[PDB]
Amino acid sequence: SGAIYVGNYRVVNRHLATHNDWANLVWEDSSRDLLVSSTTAQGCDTIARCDCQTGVYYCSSRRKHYPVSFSKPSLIFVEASEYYPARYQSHLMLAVGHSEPGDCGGILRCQHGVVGIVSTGGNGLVGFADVRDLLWLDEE
Ligand SMILES: NC(=O)[C@H]1CCCN(C(=O)CC2CSC2)C1
Ligand SMILES: [Zn+2]
């Protein structure tokens, strides 16, 4: 579990969104595994607006932050889950990290701010939903 709190937005994995998220919906995209809902209180996270391919992510199944190298956002095949059917998830970045279920949500960050949020993983893979192109998170 985990979310990004920027401005009056809460960014979560779409497959972990609550009823309150759906009832206060701003934007959702199943192909990216992302959902954004509105918040009453202002958040403290800042979104990175950069081209970093190195950063650090939080792994809840280890209680640890790990440094990682990650690929550029791309269309990657995601096998069948209890969450989605075989498809291609877009705007996904992969790294060698550990992951296990209970993982989605953890933040990936660089020196500029938040880059994205664990979304994929396994056999040593940990893939993350990029948010750096969502410029509207910084306003309104
Ligand atoms: N984004 C997806 O399609 C996910 C949905 C949940 C399951 N999934 C995973 O890769 C689970 C790993 C271990 S924590 C992430 C595919
Ligand atoms: Zn950066």
One domain for residues 58 and 127: yes
One domain for residues 29 and 53: no
The strand pairing partners of 54, in sequence order, are 69
Ligand nearest to the CA of 30: 1
Q: Which domain holds residue 16?
A: 3-44
Verify whether ligand 1 is closer than 6 Å to residue 30 (CB atom).
Answer: no
Q: How many other CB atoms are there within 10 angstroms of residue 24's CB atom? A: 14
Q: What distances in angstroms separate CA 47 from CA 6, 59, 61, 132, one per listed residue?
A: 7, 19, 24, 7
Verify whether ligand 1 is closer than 6 Å to residue 13 (CB atom).
Answer: no
Q: Spell out which residues have Cβ within 5 A of ligand 2, the ion.
A: 48, 50, 52, 110, 112
DSSP conformational letter for 22:
H
Structure determination technique employed: X-ray
Q: At 87, which amino acid appears?
A: R
One domain for residues 35 and 59: no
One domain for residues 37 and 63: no
One domain for residues 73 and 91: yes
Q: Which among 119, 117, 123 has a CA at the least distance from the CA of 55?
A: 117
Q: At 64, which amino acid appears?
A: K
Query: Which single residue is written with the structure tokens 């993350």?
Result: 128
Q: Which among 68, 119, 69 has a CA at the least distance from the CA of 90?
A: 119
Domain count, the chain: 2
Q: What is the resolution in angstroms?
A: 1.2
One domain for residues 76 and 133: yes
59 is catalytic: no
Instruction: Look up residue 111 and give its two tokens.
Output: 């020196």
One domain for residues 94 and 37: no
One domain for residues 81 and 110: yes
Burial profile 102-136: b = 16 or more Cβ within 10 angstroms, e = fewer: ebbbbbbbbeebbbbbbbbbeeeebbbbbbbebee
One domain for residues 35 and 72: no
Q: What percent of the residues of the chain are helix, what percent strand, and what percent coil, each to the nearest 5?
A: 10, 55, 35
Q: What distances in angstroms separate CA 42 from CA 3, 46, 67, one per listed residue?
A: 13, 11, 28
